[PDB]
Amino acid sequence: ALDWRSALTADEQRSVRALVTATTAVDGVAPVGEQVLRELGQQRTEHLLVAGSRPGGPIIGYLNLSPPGGAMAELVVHPQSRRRGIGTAMARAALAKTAGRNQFWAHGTLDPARATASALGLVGVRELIQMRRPLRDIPEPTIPDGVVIRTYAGTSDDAELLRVNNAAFAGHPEQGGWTAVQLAERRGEAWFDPDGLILAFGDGRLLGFHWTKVHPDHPGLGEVYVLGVDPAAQRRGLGQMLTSIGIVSLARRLVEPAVLLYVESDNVAAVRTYQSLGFTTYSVDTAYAL
Numbered sequence: 001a002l003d004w005r006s007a008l009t010a011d012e013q014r015s016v017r018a019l020v021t022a023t024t025a026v027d028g029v030a031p032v033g034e035q036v037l038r039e040l041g042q043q044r045t046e047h048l049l050v051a052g053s054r055p056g057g058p059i060i061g062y063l064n065l066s067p068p069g070g071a072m073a074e075l076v077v078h079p080q081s082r083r084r085g086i087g088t089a090m091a092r093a094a095l096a097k098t099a100g101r102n103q104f105w106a107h108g109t110l111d112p113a114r115a116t117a118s119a120l121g122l123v124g125v126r127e128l129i130q131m132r133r134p135l136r137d138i139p140e141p142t143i144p145d146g147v148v149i150r151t152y153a154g155t156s157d158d159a160e161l162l163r164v165n166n167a168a169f170a171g172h173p174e175q176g177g178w179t180a181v182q183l184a185e186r187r188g189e190a191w192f193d194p195d196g197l198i199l200a201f202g203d204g205r206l207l208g209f210h211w212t213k214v215h216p217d218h219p220g221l222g223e224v225y226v227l228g229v230d231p232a233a234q235r236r237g238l239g240q241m242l243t244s245i246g247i248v249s250l251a252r253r254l255v256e257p258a259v260l261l262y263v264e265s266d267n268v269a270a271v272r273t274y275q276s277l278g279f280t281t282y283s284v285d286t287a288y289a290l
């Protein structure tokens with residue numbers, strides 16, 4: 001009988017991290033994301049832990065349900081305990097609990113998840129594509145005159161940065177409607193580098209920005225973290241230009257070494273921008289729902 005938990009002891013947390021680590025080693029992709037792992041020590045989400053057969057042992061299944069749209073579930077069954085109905089049981093428990101509204105993330109959209117989705121009568125409703133390109137044979141930026149490029153100068157630039165971010169991402173669930181609070185939270189992370197946030201200004205109002213990211217724990221990789229062009233300055237080549245400039249900067253600072261990004265599969269403009277600069281699909285995360 002699956003018991004929804006709102007909190008976990010230190011041992012239980014260690015048992016879930018062990019299950020996740022064991023699974024990544026076999027599957028080659030982590031089964032739940034980094035934020036799920038940060039939620040293990042908090043009381044903000046709900047969890048299912050499926051214990052093994054004998055006392056004193058490791059767990060064999062885990063599901064996290066994060067509140068919102070519908071809630072989002074991430075789950076994992078140990079490679080050695082698959083094809084025994086555990087994933088199906090935890091998934092049906094989440095659907096019953098959320099009235100059939102929650103979604104499920106499948107990192108890497110691996111064969112088992114696709115089949116399990118099929119078996120549960122779910123369909124893919126979102127695809128988040130991770131694209132990558134090598135740090136070699138990189139593009140050259142074309143800077144149109146009437147535009148000047150420089151890096152972020154601190155809080156002096158925040159008003160414009162939020163204005164542009166919020167105009168470009170207007171109506172976007174998570175990236176739109178930002179405030180100084182979101183900026184401060186990110187500037188507070190160890191990976192932040194003000195010189196990695198590139199800005200293009202008219203020659204002037206901010207026209208667009210490309211926030212790049214190098215994480216200390218993933219050597220040799222750079223990320224196009226947020227790219228946004230004010231709609232008043234879109235369709236003039238700035239988005240590509242900014243992405244190019246960021247690749248140059250990351251390649252200077254830095255499987256194979258590379259620049260990666262995550263983009264919604266139906267974001268036509270961004271996908272085209274990235275395709276023009278040589279990015280290709282590396283992996284896809286599919287959100288499954290009824």
Ligand SMILES: CC(=O)SCCNC(=O)CCNC(=O)[C@H](O)C(C)(C)COP(=O)(O)OP(=O)(O)OC[C@H]1O[C@@H](n2cnc3c(N)ncnc32)[C@H](O)[C@@H]1OP(=O)(O)O
Nearest residue numbers: 031076077082083084085086087088106112113115116119
């Ligand atoms: C919709 C989702 O599951 S999103 C889940 C995202 N999580 C992951 O991808 C993490 C890595 N994968 C896992 O942890 C597991 O493989 C899970 C959670 C996807 C499935 O866990 P399991 O406990 O093996 O699922 P379960 O035993 O209930 O399988 C249900 C049915 O789906 C199918 N299925 C599951 N895995 C496979 C597979 N590798 N190949 C073919 N069919 C499969 C079968 O029809 C199966 O029943 P059957 O064994 O009687 O034929």
Ligand SMILES: CC(=O)SCCNC(=O)CCNC(=O)[C@H](O)C(C)(C)COP(=O)(O)OP(=O)(O)OC[C@H]1O[C@@H](n2cnc3c(N)ncnc32)[C@H](O)[C@@H]1OP(=O)(O)O
Nearest residue numbers: 168226227228229234235236237238239240269270272276
């Ligand atoms: C990793 C991430 O940041 S994913 C999130 C990306 N950012 C967003 O979704 C924010 C909202 N969108 C935007 O800010 C912009 O549309 C951007 C940044 C994606 C592109 O900015 P732009 O300045 O318009 O880019 P640019 O003028 O160089 O055009 C690049 C390509 O997109 C295409 N494009 C631009 N706007 C559109 C549009 N409205 N419809 C269809 N295609 C478009 C261009 O035709 C061009 O295609 P091509 O590469 O095949 O030549």
